[PDB]
Design a protein around this ligand. Structure first.
Ligand SMILES: [Zn+2]
Length: 150
């Protein structure tokens, strides 16, 4: 039957951070932290994760695309508060700690998680007419080892 695999979230050790609109009743049931402005929350799990978050701030990284189903290297900025337009299933609200990346085409809306050569940055937050909004996990790394530059 099935074949394609996907996580749609970031599993870190005994803490799993996923998008609020993507979290399940179980995520909130055992949720330790949750930032509305970041639309992200952290829940505890028994099974160790398989992802390593990067503690870097490189302006260049690679994001995953659902349409392309491939990894896309793109440069982005880490704007604090970004007003997300009412799209998909979210109302025009303010989001904190979101990184945006302007692609070079029309496609590119959602995907998975934004990872850098050092580690994991964040998950797909909101998107624009040609930009990629990602919720950085650099504001709540308390989950596992962090990536450094030294
Ligand atoms: Zn990096």
């Amino acid at each position: 039957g099935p074949y394609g695999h996907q996580s749609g979230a970031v599993y870190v050790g005994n803490y799993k951070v996923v998008n609020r609109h993507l979290a399940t009743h179980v995520d909130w049931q055992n949720c330790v932290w949750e930032d509305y402005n970041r639309d992200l929350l952290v829940s505890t799990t028994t099974a160790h994760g398989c992802d390593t978050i990067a503690r870097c701030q490189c302006t260049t990284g690679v994001y995953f695309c659902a349409s392309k189903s491939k990894h896309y290297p793109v440069s982005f900025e880490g704007p604090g508060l970004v007003e997300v337009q009412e799209s998909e299933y979210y109302p025009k609200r303010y989001q904190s700690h979101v990184l945006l990346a302007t692609g070079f085409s029309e496609p590119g809306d959602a995907g998975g998680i934004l990872r850098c050569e050092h580690g994991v940055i964040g998950l797909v937050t909101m998107g624009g007419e040609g930009v990629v909004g990602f919720a950085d996990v650099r504001d709540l790394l308390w989950l596992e080892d962090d990536a450094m530059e030294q």
